[PDB]
Symmetry: C3
Subunit: 163 residues, 3 copies
């Protein structure tokens, strides 16, 4: 799937397959009526927001998150743009990537993503969520149930085409 890095609300840890929603700029399990933005994913071929690499703040950024470049002038003026390092930056601090912190999740936003399902979910049918687990409903299109629902497990797994 195509995915993005998001932060869980309580700094929780939402296991893969649960449908997720936003509350105060963070992700949690999705209940009914609530809008499903995606599914926690381990299958993502393309994911945005993994500063992996350097602290997300190493360079300053404008109001729209874009790297602020200073314009440097030289030999009667060859001009080039170079990034504008943060005042708060610390090379004394040691950086841990987002794919190693626990508050950070890979959330799949588009494509075939495997989802936790209940007994209600059917092939060729849409879905809602309660407890973050899928249940027959209004959204996306269930591709195929891949590991069928059992009461002992509490869940099954279907591929849903999230768009």
């Amino acid at each position: 799937d195509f995915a993005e890095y998001f932060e869980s609300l309580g700094g929780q840890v939402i296991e893969t397959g649960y449908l997720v929603t936003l509350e105060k700029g963070k992700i949690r399990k999705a209940e009914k009526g609530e809008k499903i933005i995606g599914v926690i994913s381990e299958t993502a071929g393309f994911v945005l927001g993994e500063s992996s690499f350097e602290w997300q703040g190493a360079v300053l950024k404008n109001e729209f998150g874009g790297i602020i470049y200073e314009e440097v002038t030289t030999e009667d003026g060859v001009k080039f743009k170079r990034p504008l390092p943060n005042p708060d930056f610390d090379p004394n601090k040691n950086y841990i990537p987002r794919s190693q912190r626990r508050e950070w999740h890979v959330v799949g936003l588009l494509g075939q993503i495997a989802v936790r399902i209940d007994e209600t979910v059917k092939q060729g049918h849409s879905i809602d969520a309660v407890g973050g687990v899928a249940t027959d409903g209004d959204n996306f299109i269930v591709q195929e149930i891949t590991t069928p629902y059992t009461k002992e497990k509490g869940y099954g797994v279907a591929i849903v085409l999230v768009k």
Copy 2:
């Protein structure tokens, strides 16, 4: 466009430009009312699901399609994770990529994608599908008709912005 690999229902071959839908976990031409998931595409800059590379099953995967890693222990315990090869795997078998099998299609899910249109389709207007060909309707936004509809050809081509 941003796209994904899908399998056609009868192991068919759906030519590029046709709008497509799902039936029992596979793709076919899209008729009316049916949900359009995408368009067969030759313009995809980013496509998921092309194992290209190795048999999709070389390594085992959990219930959510994610690579199962075994935890290996060493000199009083340096620990690292290594993939867990399939029992069914055969290095005696010779592997053909998905971009060479005929049941596998590049399906464009997001972005400007060229679509087969009829006489009804107009600029700045939405679309439906019948026969997999576009027809004036409710979905997406027709960017521009690029090769206008003729009865002799049976179709025209418009760029649609699929989202």
Copy 3:
């Protein structure tokens, strides 16, 4: 965000953060009721349509934008496909990339994108657009207001999750 290159309608220049729509196959600021296709973006990790590289026309393309390949035959017939150069192509012309022309914009279509907001926009709430600036409404989900609305500036900045 995941983004695409688009051309502005009057060959304008739409600054980053404005919501945008289509009119006659081109982008302009989005007003009310109109469909929001995206937001001008400087944060795009993946963007399609930047020929960067060579004139978009160097090679010929079929009716669906896909590279036409000629089939070449050799020593009793090893066959390979090679691109089919345009009649109109000029190696006497010198090529300027799309990321340097002014009519070409990076439009973010999916993911967390920073957007210009008014006084009305709230956290956890949907949006519409007037003047291309966000205003409380029906679309997407406002993640967090990052630079709060002031009358003196005329706008604030919120992260919206465009899908």
